[PDB]
Subunit: 164 residues, 3 copies
């Protein structure tokens, strides 16, 4: 192989590994902003082209506006992603598998106060690169399991970033 | 350093980082297929040379056949890997540390219906590259802890991919 | 762009991706040694320049000596890191976000026997590279939540690496 061919071949491989890293970083930011309810920053993770259902939502603002109502202050959520499988499909598209464990806790001001939900899911994300930045375009999952229960009322929540 | 030496040095580094990525991806696939009970695909994660104990099992089919019996429909499992430490030992061999949290739930058709098991473990995997693809060759762990208990019978399992 | 400029540009990118990988590996080692109470090896994760508060501790030994007393044999801990966001700030400095789930169990010899603590946190680490190796320089977190409770006394801990 030529000098220029080998540099070209290396340059495309480094770009692919940068894309993989940026997508993993994007997903980390997504989960942090979702659970932190940092809605302004979470909006920046979502493709401008995002359309979601689920009555559909068009664009990052409508989607993030929905999350703001579906995930109020009174719900502590943890969406914990494990062992990704990222595939770069083209220079502007990618697919990513993430193994989720999810926990929901409903605090005393919730209509569902005392409730807990635990689950797991195999998520498949689609990403796209718009104007040189990777975004989440769509998401879907296969539910592994989900459980609903009333939390032991003797559990003391001593810290909560969403409280007053 | 020469032009060709620098290209050679870069080419081996990119290969190493591709191998690391492929091994992390392999492990993600492994856990997904194990917990999903997708046994045909899980078999593809295991080296053709795999021998396991545990009375030994030889080859991917015997090993995956054992998992099929040891992890029936009635057991929801989550094997959740965290913070890997991957070391590429040679061009065809690698070692990987994974911090596991494991959960087992026994559903109502199990002989052990109502039982839960939680634990943690420091796993060390060995991988090998056979005919240009990375596989899991062997695994072992140090148990951090394990706990056994009867689940609160008021917990409603509302979703379960293994059910009818 | 020149041949030498393109090799130089590739060489700095590969170094950055090696640094990212080394830092993720460092963090894995950190959590494993912390939860394993492998204090000699955990000391090696900490920058020689580390100063901590928390009355301050100076250096890896003082810091690791504190952990040895604050995390006795009788406390099973799991510090489970998820979905990192690593940024290399310069050739010798970096920042890393890690989403933590933490669990603490107090075994029967603890003064707090039967107690459990669960939580989550958004950690931000600072790392530095001293004499060609990455270390943890400082850490801080935003607590997502924390809960305290008495464990169901019918839970049997069947395995525990910290026991006799
Ligand atoms: Co986890
Ligand atoms: Na968990």
């Amino acid at each position: 192989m030529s000098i220029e061919e080998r540099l070209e071949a290396l340059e495309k491989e480094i770009q692919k590994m940068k894309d993989i890293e940026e997508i993993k970083k994007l997903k980390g930011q997504y989960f942090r902003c979702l659970d932190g309810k940092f809605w302004d920053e979470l909006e920046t993770t979502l493709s401008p082209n995002i359309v979601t259902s689920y009555l559909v939502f068009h664009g990052p603002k409508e989607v993030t506006d929905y999350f703001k109502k579906a995930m109020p202050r009174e719900e502590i959520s943890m969406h914990m992603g494990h062992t990704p499988e990222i595939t770069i499909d083209s220079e502007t598209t990618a697919t990513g598998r993430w193994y989720l464990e999810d926990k929901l806790i409903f605090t005393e001001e919730s209509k569902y106060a005392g409730s807990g939900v635990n689950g797991g899911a195999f998520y498949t994300d689609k990403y796209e690169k718009v104007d040189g930045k990777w975004y989440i375009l769509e998401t879907g999952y296969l539910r592994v399991y989900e459980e609903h229960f009333m939390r032991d009322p003797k559990i003391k929540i001593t810290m909560n970033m969403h409280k007053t």
